[PDB]
From a paper:
Two proteins, HdeA and HdeB, were discovered as abundant periplasmic proteins in stationary-phase Escherichia coli cells, and genetic studies implicated them in survival of extremely acid pH. HdeA and HdeB have been shown, in vitro, to have acid-activated chaperone functions; that is, by binding to acid-denatured proteins, they prevent these other proteins from irreversible aggregation and precipitation. Like HdeA, HdeB is dimeric at neutral pH but forms monomers at low pH (∼ pH 3.5). We have determined the structure of HdeB and the mechanism of its acid sensing, identifying two critical salt bridges that are broken upon exposure to low pH.
Here, we report the crystal structure of HdeB at pH 4.5 and biophysical characterization of HdeB at both acid and neutral pH. The asymmetric unit of the crystal contains four protein monomers with residues A30 to A102 ordered; six C-terminal residues and the His-tag are disordered. The monomeric structure is composed of two 12-residue helices (α2 and α3), three short (4 or 5 residues) helices (α1, α4, and α5), and interconnecting loops. Analysis with PISA13 reveals that the four monomers in the asymmetric unit are arranged as two identical dimers of HdeB. The dimer is identified as stable by the program PISA13 and the dimer interface buries in total 2400 Å2 of surface area, much of it involving hydrophobic residues. There are six main-chain intersubunit hydrogen bonds (akin to a β-sheet interaction) formed between the loop from each monomer that connects the two long helices. Two tryptophan residues (W55 and W56) and a tyrosine residue (Y64) from each monomer come together to make a cluster of aromatic residues at the C-terminal end of α2. The crystal structure shows an intersubunit salt bridge at the dimer interface of HdeB: E41 from one subunit with K48 from the other and internal salt bridge within each monomer D76–H59. Asp76 makes a polar contact with the indole nitrogen of Trp55 and a salt bridge with His59, which in turn stacks against the indole of W55. The two α2 helices in the HdeA dimer are almost parallel, whereas they are almost perpendicular in the HdeB dimer.
Residue numbers in the entry:
A (entry chain A): 32 to 100
B (entry chain B): 30 to 100
The structure:
């Protein structure tokens, strides 16, 4: 029941108010934080999160975390 | 307007895909705070104790907003 177990279909079906935190976590957990003094969205997220959504629409059966491959 | 992560109600939180609860709670607890983690972004022991308290808070107060946990 971890985020790494979430499918792309589950991701695109999330309450919209959950999609940004979930996408952020997938993109950033277990990576170096490069975003500055405070935790915030940054331009990388502006460009990547829409790509995650599109990737998951095209590949709903794949796990969300396969975006990183 | 009413569609942002900051606007999530406690009822919405307890109704989430269970796989989303930890990332949503983490973001609520950490967004806009000073980053005090190590080299990489990981859960810490404060998250271990606080995230269950977030779940309990929203179960007890479904009418309140998630982000009011911080108050």
């Amino acid at each position: 029941e971890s985020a790494k177990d979430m499918t792309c279909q589950e991701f695109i079906d999330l309450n919209p108010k959950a999609m940004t935190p979930v996408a952020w976590w997938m993109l950033h957990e277990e990576t170096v934080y490069k975003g500055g003094d405070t935790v915030t969205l940054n331009e990388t997220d502006l460009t990547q999160i829409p790509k995650v959504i599109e990737y998951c629409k095209k590949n709903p059966q794949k796990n969300l975390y396969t975006f990183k491959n």
